[PDB]
From a paper:
pmcHydrogenases are metalloenzymes that catalyze the interconversion between protons (H+), electrons (e−) and hydrogen (H2). Among them, [FeFe]‐hydrogenases exhibit the highest activity for both H2 production and oxidation. Their catalytic cofactor, termed H‐cluster, consists of a [4Fe4S] sub‐cluster ([4Fe]H) and a diiron moiety ([2Fe]H) bridged through a cysteine residue. The amine base is connected to the protein surface through a conserved proton transfer pathway (PTP) for rapid H+ shuttling.
Two crystals of 1.39 Å and 1.5 Å, termed CpI‐CN−‐1 and CpI‐CN−‐2 in the following, were analyzed in depth. They were compared to two structures of CO‐treated CpI for which we obtained higher resolutions (1.34 Å and 1.52 Å; termed Hox‐CO‐1 and Hox‐CO‐2 hereafter) than previously reported. The four newly obtained structures feature strong electron densities at the OCS at Fed that are not present in the structure of untreated CpI. The refined occupancies indicate that the OCS is fully occupied by an extrinsic ligand in CN−‐treated CpI, whereas only 71 to 93 % of the OCS of CO‐treated crystals hold an extrinsic ligand. The latter is possibly due to an insufficient partial pressure of CO in the crystallization wells. CO binds to the OCS of the H‐cluster, and CO and CN− are isoelectronic, making it challenging to distinguish them by electron density analysis. To the best of our knowledge, conformational changes of PTP residues have never been observed in structures of untreated CpI wild type proteins. They are also absent from three independently prepared structures obtained by CO treatment as well as from the sulfide (SH−) ‐bound Desulfovibrio desulfuricans [FeFe]‐hydrogenase.
Author numbering: 1 to 573
The structure:
């Protein structure tokens, strides 16, 4: 056993763990900054977690294991002096102007500055702020006037994606973070998934803003602005209005969007049902033609970029169905004018996404037809929250309203898209009915749900057995391929999400304090909202969506054929 003294208190423990973890488990406060995801910044450690160990001196609690005999002090003057000094030195390289800053209300660094009453020795007031900012990407932006060089984004990129597309760089003799060779992220192997943003404790990493695109369209007299939110938004955005975690705020969102001036309130879950119509039809076709196998989902643009950059030989195996965002957008410029009288050129289609990579997808040159973009702007969950707050809309006290039904109705299958395994489960519900020409009652595929990184199942479709896999996070895609797991059997249908947990954990989602992440499983609680909707919806299959059925009957025809196949599909070359 080990006997540990912390701040005069004796502990007897068998645990093999760090001082930081042991202290935290025993209600002893130790600050941290560069420690996250069970890693710290191994070179140029932040030292905010400093403690004193008798007989050794000052040590970093976050990467020092407890040893029998240690006597530790976490709150001596020497300790607080050192921590304050490191915060002061960070302020010397930080444009400390919180007023207009997009992390003003939830900044980890600000909290530490306040906790230790630190001040800069010489305030940093960049003039060529141009020099510190990189806005070239369609999805990410960097503001180095805020960057603490804490490495959390580099560590998060490595762990979440294994691309190491975010790097430390030596730029004219100063250390920065950025992409390979200081290129635009979009021109590197980066997936544009934004996990580096989620990991950042300050406003040094952000999404590429579309808020001006949106406001300009809202204010243009002749534009008719459609808005449609992703599955995950309704499970998440309430966090930023102090409503807590796991709160379903669907109806409040619809009201807020009307109060912001949007002209039509639809829902990307309608697009999710459309993607299932096309993709489940495609799966049945591929079964009847014995391939090609495996078919991969094509709805996650982080995964599409991963395939493009590392597995281009798989691009032809991706489903040709457009993603819910792009398939909805295509219909918003074709079907929707046909049922409304709008001039298609005057329709401006906005989505709200938990995702930064969706901005790149929407701006792909060929995601348009007859000069009309499928999707004209994409705002993240965070961006919508800012728009609501800037307009002084009292979100938490809004009454519930409904979407406009024509492209707004959704089934429970579409509702679960935002969780890892949701697309797989939704697609199987329709594919099995399609293949067996039946209306089956057992529709729940629990085996593909949850947070395991690589999940598989055998499913029986029309009296034959098929193998499916759900790949949960970009790093797990690499593991699945490089390990040869793909070779252990013939897989027929594989879901891939780049963000572990699915889109509920996407790079456009609300930041969560690392100490809130110790008390809340964010991936599970956000997903729970979506499964709950599925459980209480009357229609739980995409092909039972009444508004969608009318759309195919009256405009697109049979899925996966004819008109449907000509404009609702996309292949990467
Ligand atoms: S990143 Fe945090 S400390 Fe820095 S200016 Fe923004 S809110 Fe203030
Ligand atoms: S967007 Fe994703 S892949 Fe690109 S640097 Fe950030 S974490 Fe890495
Ligand atoms: S961008 Fe953010 S996470 Fe990355 S080193 Fe700078 S402060 Fe840390
Ligand atoms: S998992 Fe969802 S949020 Fe993450 S990159 Fe893919 S589409 Fe975007
Ligand atoms: S938090 Fe321990 S060195 Fe940064
Ligand atoms: Cl309508
Ligand atoms: Mg370390
Ligand atoms: Mg307007």
């Amino acid at each position: 056993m080990k006997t540990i003294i912390i701040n005069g208190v004796q502990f007897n423990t068998d645990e093999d763990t760090t001082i930081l973890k042991f202290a935290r488990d025993n209600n002893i406060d130790i600050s941290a900054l560069c420690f996250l995801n069970n890693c710290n910044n191994d070179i140029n450690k932040c030292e905010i977690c400093t403690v004193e160990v008798e007989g050794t001196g000052l040590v970093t609690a976050c990467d020092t294991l407890i040893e029998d005999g240690m006597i530790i002090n976490t709150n001596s003057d020497a300790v607080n002096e050192k921590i304050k000094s490191r915060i002061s030195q960070l302020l010397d390289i930080h444009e400390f102007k919180c007023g207009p800053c997009n992390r003003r209300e939830n900044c980890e660094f600000l909290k530490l500055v306040i906790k230790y009453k630190a001040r800069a020795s010489k305030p940093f007031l960049p003039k060529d702020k141009t020099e510190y900012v990189d806005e070239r990407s369609k999805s990410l932006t960097v503001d180095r006037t805020k960057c603490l060089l804490c490495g959390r984004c580099v560590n998060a990129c490595g762990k979440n994606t294994e691309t190491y597309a975010m790097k430390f760089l030596n730029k004219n003799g100063k250390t920065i973070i950025g992409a390979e060779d200081e290129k635009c992220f979009d021109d590197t192997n980066c997936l544009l998934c934004g996990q580096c943003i989620i990991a950042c404790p300050v406003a040094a990493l952000s999404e590429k803003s579309h808020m001006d695109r949106v406001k300009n369209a809202l204010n243009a007299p002749e534009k008719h602005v459609i808005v449609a939110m992703a599955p995950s938004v309704r499970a998440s955005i309430g966090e930023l209005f102090n409503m807590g975690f796991g709160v379903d705020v669907t109806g409040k969102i619809y009201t807020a969007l009307r109060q912001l001036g949007f002209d039509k309130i639809f829902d990307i879950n309608f697009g999710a049902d459309m993607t299932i119509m096309e993709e489940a039809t495609e799966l049945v076709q591929r079964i009847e033609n014995n391939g090609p196998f495996p078919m991969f989902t094509s709805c996650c643009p982080g995964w599409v970029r991963q395939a493009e950059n590392y597995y281009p030989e798989l691009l032809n195996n991706l489903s040709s169905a457009k993603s819910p965002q792009q398939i909805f957008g295509t219909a918003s410029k074709t079907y929707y004018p046909s049922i409304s009288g709008l001039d298609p050129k005057n329709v401006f289609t906005v989505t709200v996404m938990p995702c930064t990579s969706k901005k790149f997808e929407a701006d792909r040159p060929q995601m348009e037809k007859d000069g009309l973009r499928d999707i004209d702007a994409v705002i993240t969950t965070r961006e919508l929250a800012k728009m609501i707050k800037d307009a002084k809309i009292p979100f938490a006290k809004l009454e519930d309203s409904e979407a406009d039904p024509a492209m707004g109705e959704y089934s429970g299958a579409g509702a679960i898209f935002g969780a890892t395994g949701g697309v797989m489960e939704a697609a199987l519900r329709s594919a099995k009915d399609f293949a067996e020409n039946a209306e089956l009652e057992d529709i729940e595929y629990k085996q593909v749900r949850g947070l395991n990184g690589i999940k598989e199942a055998e499913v029986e479709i029309n009296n034959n057995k098929y193998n499916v896999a759900v790949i949960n996070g970009a790093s797990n895609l690499f593991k699945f391929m490089k390990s040869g797991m793909i070779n252990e059997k013939q897989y027929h249908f594989i879901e891939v999400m780049a963000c572990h947990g699915g889109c509920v954990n996407g790079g456009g989602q609300p930041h969560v304090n690392p100490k809130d992440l110790e008390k809340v499983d964010i991936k599970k609680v956000r997903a729970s909202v979506l499964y709950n909707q599925d459980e209480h919806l009357s229609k739980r299959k995409s092909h039972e969506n009444t508004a969608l059925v009318k759309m195919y009957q009256n405009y697109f025809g049979k899925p996966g054929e004819g008109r449907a196949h000509e404009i609702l599909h996309f292949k990467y070359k």
